[PDB]
Design a protein around this motif. Structure first.
Motif, PDB file in Angstrom:
ATOM      1  N   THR A  76     108.738  30.171  27.221  1.00  0.00           N
ATOM      2  CA  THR A  76     109.766  31.127  26.904  1.00  0.00           C
ATOM      3  C   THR A  76     110.510  31.692  28.142  1.00  0.00           C
ATOM      4  OG1 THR A  76     108.178  33.080  26.746  1.00  0.00           O
ATOM      5  CG2 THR A  76     108.500  31.599  24.705  1.00  0.00           C
ATOM      6  N   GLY A  77     110.063  31.374  29.348  1.00  0.00           N
ATOM      7  CA  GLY A  77     110.658  31.975  30.546  1.00  0.00           C
ATOM      8  C   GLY A  77     109.912  31.448  31.749  1.00  0.00           C
ATOM      9  N   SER A  78     110.479  31.697  32.917  1.00  0.00           N
ATOM     10  CA  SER A  78     109.748  31.365  34.141  1.00  0.00           C
ATOM     11  C   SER A  78     109.549  32.659  34.892  1.00  0.00           C
ATOM     12  CB  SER A  78     110.565  30.407  35.018  1.00  0.00           C
ATOM     13  OG  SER A  78     110.941  29.198  34.356  1.00  0.00           O
ATOM     14  N   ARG A  79     108.401  32.772  35.593  1.00  0.00           N
ATOM     15  CA  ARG A  79     108.137  33.971  36.392  1.00  0.00           C
ATOM     16  C   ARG A  79     107.771  33.492  37.788  1.00  0.00           C
ATOM     17  NH1 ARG A  79     105.463  32.599  31.245  1.00  0.00           N
ATOM     18  NH2 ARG A  79     107.085  33.495  29.828  1.00  0.00           N
ATOM     19  N   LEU A  80     108.539  33.973  38.734  1.00  0.00           N
ATOM     20  CA  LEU A  80     108.268  33.750  40.149  1.00  0.00           C
ATOM     21  C   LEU A  80     107.364  34.889  40.634  1.00  0.00           C
ATOM     22  CD1 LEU A  80     108.906  32.635  43.045  1.00  0.00           C
ATOM     23  CD2 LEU A  80     110.853  34.153  43.082  1.00  0.00           C
ATOM     24  N   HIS A  81     106.287  34.503  41.304  1.00  0.00           N
ATOM     25  CA  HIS A  81     105.436  35.452  42.028  1.00  0.00           C
ATOM     26  C   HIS A  81     105.425  35.041  43.488  1.00  0.00           C
ATOM     27  CE1 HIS A  81     103.491  36.707  38.145  1.00  0.00           C
ATOM     28  NE2 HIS A  81     103.672  35.431  37.837  1.00  0.00           N
ATOM     29  N   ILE A  82     105.560  36.003  44.378  1.00  0.00           N
ATOM     30  CA  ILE A  82     105.131  35.759  45.764  1.00  0.00           C
ATOM     31  C   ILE A  82     103.850  36.548  45.997  1.00  0.00           C
ATOM     32  CG2 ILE A  82     105.764  35.986  48.207  1.00  0.00           C
ATOM     33  CD1 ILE A  82     108.717  35.626  47.366  1.00  0.00           C
ATOM     34  N   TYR A  83     102.845  35.896  46.557  1.00  0.00           N
ATOM     35  CA  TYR A  83     101.523  36.534  46.825  1.00  0.00           C
ATOM     36  C   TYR A  83     101.213  36.498  48.317  1.00  0.00           C
ATOM     37  CZ  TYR A  83     100.444  35.809  41.825  1.00  0.00           C
ATOM     38  OH  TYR A  83     100.427  35.983  40.466  1.00  0.00           O
ATOM     39  N   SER A  84     100.708  37.598  48.884  1.00  0.00           N
ATOM     40  CA  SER A  84     100.118  37.594  50.205  1.00  0.00           C
ATOM     41  C   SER A  84      98.621  37.565  50.038  1.00  0.00           C
ATOM     42  CB  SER A  84     100.592  38.791  51.051  1.00  0.00           C
ATOM     43  OG  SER A  84     100.166  40.011  50.439  1.00  0.00           O
ATOM     44  N   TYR A  85      97.904  36.970  50.988  1.00  0.00           N
ATOM     45  CA  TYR A  85      96.448  36.932  50.910  1.00  0.00           C
ATOM     46  C   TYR A  85      95.862  36.587  52.278  1.00  0.00           C
ATOM     47  CZ  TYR A  85      97.006  31.798  50.571  1.00  0.00           C
ATOM     48  OH  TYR A  85      97.390  30.509  50.783  1.00  0.00           O
ATOM     49  N   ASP A  86      94.577  36.937  52.449  1.00  0.00           N
ATOM     50  CA  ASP A  86      93.764  36.505  53.556  1.00  0.00           C
ATOM     51  C   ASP A  86      92.757  35.507  53.064  1.00  0.00           C
ATOM     52  OD1 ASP A  86      95.034  38.269  55.429  1.00  0.00           O
ATOM     53  OD2 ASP A  86      93.956  39.877  54.512  1.00  0.00           O
ATOM     54  N   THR A  87      91.974  34.947  53.991  1.00  0.00           N
ATOM     55  CA  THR A  87      90.973  33.978  53.593  1.00  0.00           C
ATOM     56  C   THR A  87      89.629  34.340  54.205  1.00  0.00           C
ATOM     57  OG1 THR A  87      91.532  32.481  55.410  1.00  0.00           O
ATOM     58  CG2 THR A  87      92.628  32.076  53.321  1.00  0.00           C
ATOM     59  N   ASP A  88      88.570  34.079  53.458  1.00  0.00           N
ATOM     60  CA  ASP A  88      87.254  34.404  53.874  1.00  0.00           C
ATOM     61  C   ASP A  88      86.666  33.227  54.614  1.00  0.00           C
ATOM     62  OD1 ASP A  88      86.168  32.443  52.090  1.00  0.00           O
ATOM     63  OD2 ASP A  88      85.556  33.956  50.634  1.00  0.00           O
ATOM     64  N   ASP A  89      85.382  33.351  54.929  1.00  0.00           N
ATOM     65  CA  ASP A  89      84.620  32.374  55.687  1.00  0.00           C
ATOM     66  C   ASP A  89      84.877  30.922  55.435  1.00  0.00           C
ATOM     67  OD1 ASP A  89      83.608  34.319  57.046  1.00  0.00           O
ATOM     68  OD2 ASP A  89      81.525  34.297  56.228  1.00  0.00           O
ATOM     69  N   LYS A 130     109.818  38.103  39.820  1.00  0.00           N
ATOM     70  CA  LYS A 130     111.087  37.937  39.091  1.00  0.00           C
ATOM     71  C   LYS A 130     110.916  37.008  37.896  1.00  0.00           C
ATOM     72  CE  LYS A 130     115.974  37.543  39.193  1.00  0.00           C
ATOM     73  NZ  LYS A 130     117.227  37.044  39.820  1.00  0.00           N
ATOM     74  N   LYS A 131     111.453  37.438  36.754  1.00  0.00           N
ATOM     75  CA  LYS A 131     111.307  36.664  35.524  1.00  0.00           C
ATOM     76  C   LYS A 131     112.665  36.344  34.961  1.00  0.00           C
ATOM     77  CE  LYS A 131     107.706  39.830  34.304  1.00  0.00           C
ATOM     78  NZ  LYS A 131     106.365  39.980  33.661  1.00  0.00           N
ATOM     79  N   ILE A 132     112.803  35.135  34.439  1.00  0.00           N
ATOM     80  CA  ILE A 132     114.034  34.724  33.809  1.00  0.00           C
ATOM     81  C   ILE A 132     113.764  34.061  32.469  1.00  0.00           C
ATOM     82  CG2 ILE A 132     115.405  34.576  35.903  1.00  0.00           C
ATOM     83  CD1 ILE A 132     115.226  31.544  35.660  1.00  0.00           C
ATOM     84  N   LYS A 133     114.716  34.224  31.546  1.00  0.00           N
ATOM     85  CA  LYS A 133     114.611  33.501  30.270  1.00  0.00           C
ATOM     86  C   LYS A 133     115.846  32.611  30.156  1.00  0.00           C
ATOM     87  CE  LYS A 133     113.191  36.358  26.749  1.00  0.00           C
ATOM     88  NZ  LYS A 133     112.585  37.566  26.079  1.00  0.00           N
ATOM     89  N   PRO A 134     115.809  31.525  29.339  1.00  0.00           N
ATOM     90  CA  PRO A 134     114.694  31.112  28.541  1.00  0.00           C
ATOM     91  C   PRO A 134     113.785  30.162  29.315  1.00  0.00           C
ATOM     92  CG  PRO A 134     116.467  29.594  28.106  1.00  0.00           C
ATOM     93  CD  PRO A 134     116.972  30.616  29.168  1.00  0.00           C
ATOM     94  N   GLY A 135     112.972  29.399  28.591  1.00  0.00           N
ATOM     95  CA  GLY A 135     112.018  28.450  29.265  1.00  0.00           C
ATOM     96  C   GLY A 135     112.786  27.314  29.937  1.00  0.00           C
ATOM     97  N   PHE A 136     112.267  26.851  31.071  1.00  0.00           N
ATOM     98  CA  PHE A 136     112.900  25.783  31.860  1.00  0.00           C
ATOM     99  C   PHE A 136     113.061  24.526  31.014  1.00  0.00           C
ATOM    100  CE2 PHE A 136     112.200  22.421  35.215  1.00  0.00           C
ATOM    101  CZ  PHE A 136     113.387  22.600  35.854  1.00  0.00           C
ATOM    102  N   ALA A 137     112.035  24.183  30.201  1.00  0.00           N
ATOM    103  CA  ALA A 137     112.098  22.939  29.459  1.00  0.00           C
ATOM    104  C   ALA A 137     113.092  23.061  28.280  1.00  0.00           C
ATOM    105  CB  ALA A 137     110.698  22.532  28.973  1.00  0.00           C
ATOM    106  N   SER A 138     113.644  24.239  28.035  1.00  0.00           N
ATOM    107  CA  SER A 138     114.576  24.387  26.911  1.00  0.00           C
ATOM    108  C   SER A 138     116.014  24.189  27.327  1.00  0.00           C
ATOM    109  CB  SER A 138     114.403  25.783  26.297  1.00  0.00           C
ATOM    110  OG  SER A 138     115.142  26.764  27.022  1.00  0.00           O
ATOM    111  N   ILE A 139     116.291  24.143  28.633  1.00  0.00           N
ATOM    112  CA  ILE A 139     117.701  24.110  29.113  1.00  0.00           C
ATOM    113  C   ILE A 139     118.208  22.697  29.273  1.00  0.00           C
ATOM    114  CG2 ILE A 139     117.268  26.291  30.292  1.00  0.00           C
ATOM    115  CD1 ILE A 139     117.374  24.967  32.950  1.00  0.00           C
TER     116      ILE A 139
END
Ligand code: AMP
Ligand code: AMP
Ligand code: CL
Ligand code: CL
Ligand code: CL
Ligand code: MG
Ligand code: MG
Ligand code: MG
Lengths: 358, 356
Positions: B17-30, B43-52
């Protein structure tokens, strides 16, 4: 320009998988009913109009692609959408039609008469009229009952002669007078049982795909048409109750000849199937899909028949058509089903040409 | 910009039904396993990518709009589509990815790592990891069994702990090692049982719509959630055999707590429903749906909640969720089901950060 000497009308079939513009020339008999209907222009575009982003640039660009290179513009236009639109609520449909109306207002020549989503029952009526017009069966009172099936992407229709019947919904019947004869027809449309919609319930069914066809879930096709058919029948009957609704009526109003239009004309005409005289039986259809698609090795088959975008669906479609016709409508598996050749471009739009004049 | 000092990646959930972009920051363990995962842009957009329409102008304009105004650039991107794309054969999917790969290649500010359609089982894995990350249950060995459901537009997933079998498709089992511990999970996705696809089978069912709602066949809604639920159950079990596949496994490997993500969070959050503590029961959902939507007059209800684009479906949705979790999965109708609040922007994308 034939329209200098004949009446002319444009009718758009906005179906679930694409839209088809037809421009027809015609004359009229003494009662101003069309005769001599000839297609003078055809243009088809994909995907379906209800599938596109409902914004103005998207809708205008689509209409442009469909209509702008038509050789004749200054004529009445009917834009009639079928089951693709019926899947949307009316508020969302309105977005497409408000933009469509504005697009037309910004063109010079075109006379938009009506742009709307037609009911499945009207679709059925137009299905019957279009096929009987082509068969030349309307101008006289027929001995024999002609039934019509239309296998679309989101709905299927079935329509056949039935005398006025107080046991049946008014909404499922239509009386009409054409060419001086009176005809009552039973009409029904099943939303969700069109090919595209139905298929989305069986994409991970290994029985419905050729051997080693890559199913979305990472498993492999293991085709078996009788088993695929059984699965489809569960959606036809346990879910939609097609059998309960159609078979008792068909029993009481037998059809002598069946004609089909829609996706089945394309399958039956393909290079994978072998039928004579543009007609098939459901038993032959299921046996050919089973042997020629379901039981074949997918990579091998796909290399043997490179040109057909629908090849991968033919195990499923052969099983579904049988499921719909035989287990749903109760048609005998050995009964002849005529299909109209795809090259004839026959869809229900001729029905519009005829029906508006009655 | 935390990406100067910490690893960041962009993960796009291309749902039905939509696509949602996430940007994530993170560290890494051992062991270079991510920790301190933080969403820094959504950021979210409609409609679904496969519908266009799968053409250059359409695809390019969709991706432009999804990524425009991103406050951070010059990072790796993972574009993973789910069931909307799985509805299409590989040949049609390829038209979308060929264009999307080219568009990214021309954008010097994004490094595309992978753009592909993931299987429903991959999605179920990522669903489980994402919820259990948020719950803080991955770093240590767990005493309780946590089950997760994801209610999407074209498929639904269920995933819960389960010992090695040999007779179960290897495709429905995943052995996960994370934070140095070993976890065995059962995964299953049901394609066509997502909200949009399911609903296209019932649009002319009067039991499934508020009173007087106009059905496409010209009949009127006459809402009755118990009846609508029985209709939906035929699709769950008579067609899809959900009960036969899932109920035996839950009797043999019990789940102590359930968490749901997807459309059910939105429904449960509606002003028409009353649920506390971000949890519901199937009995309560079906009764509230029946009382507050099914048995109400459509024009009144539509005029009272004008903003809500999903309202017309809430009677169906209440019925469908019950049909799925109770008649399908075999969940007790009085069992607590946690739903993640919508404002949390939790989808399975955290799962991709953790497990590549
Ligand atoms: N080769 C083919 N085999 C089977 N179905 C087809 C083929 N080509 C087109 N169709 C189907 O014909 C139907 C026409 O429906 P509509 O677009 O709803 O008018 C759609 O379901 C198409 O996908
Ligand atoms: N406001 C809402 N109420 C009910 N369901 C929703 C709402 N917003 C989104 N959804 C559903 O959430 C699901 C998200 O699935 P997907 O787009 O496949 O990731 C889809 O079925 C949406 O239709
Ligand atoms: Cl589009
Ligand atoms: Cl899948
Ligand atoms: Cl309908
Ligand atoms: Mg059609
Ligand atoms: Mg999703
Ligand atoms: Mg780039």
């Amino acid at each position: 320009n034939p329209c200098e000497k004949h009446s002319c009308i444009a009718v758009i079939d906005a179906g679930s998988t694409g839209s088809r513009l037809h421009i027809y020339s015609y004359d009229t008999d003494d009662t101003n009913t069309p005769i001599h209907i000839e297609e003078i222009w055809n243009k088809k575009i994909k995907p379906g109009f209800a599938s596109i982003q409902p914004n103005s640039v998207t809708i205008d660009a689509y209409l442009t692609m469909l209509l702008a290179d038509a050789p004749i513009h200054n004529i009445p236009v009917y834009f009639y959408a079928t089951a693709g639109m019926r899947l949307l609520p009316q508020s969302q449909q309105k977005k497409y039609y408000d933009e469509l109306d504005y697009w037309f207002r910004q063109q010079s020549q075109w006379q938009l008469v009506e742009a709307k989503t037609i009911t499945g029952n009207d679709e059925a009526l137009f299905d019957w009229l279009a096929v009987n017009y082509k068969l030349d069966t309307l101008k006289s009172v027929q001995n024999k009952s002609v039934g019509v099936m239309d296998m679309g992407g989101a709905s299927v229709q079935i329509v056949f002669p039935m005398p006025k019947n107080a046991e049946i919904s008014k909404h499922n019947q239509v009386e009409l007078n054409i060419y001086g004869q009176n005809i009552n027809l039973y009409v029904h449309s099943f939303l969700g049982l069109g090919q595209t919609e139905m298929s989305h319930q069986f994409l991970n069914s290994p029985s419905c795909f050729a051997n080693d066809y890559p199913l979305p879930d990472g498993e492999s096709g293991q085709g078996n048409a009788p088993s695929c058919k059984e699965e489809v029948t569960s959606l036809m009957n346990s879910v939609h109750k097609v059998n309960q609704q159609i078979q008792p009526l068909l029993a009481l109003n037998p059809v002598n000849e069946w004609y089909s239009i829609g996706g089945i004309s394309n399958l039956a005409s393909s290079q994978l199937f072998h039928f004579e005289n543009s007609e098939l039986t459901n038993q032959s259809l299921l046996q050919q899909g089973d042997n020629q698609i379901c039981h074949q090795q997918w990579d091998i088959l796909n290399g043997q028949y490179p040109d057909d975008e629908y090849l991968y669906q033919y195990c499923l479609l052969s099983s579904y058509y049988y499921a719909l016709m035989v287990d749903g409508y109760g048609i005998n598996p050995n009964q002849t089903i005529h299909y109209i050749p795809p090259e004839q471009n026959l869809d229900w739009t001729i029905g519009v040409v005829l029906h508006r004049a009655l």
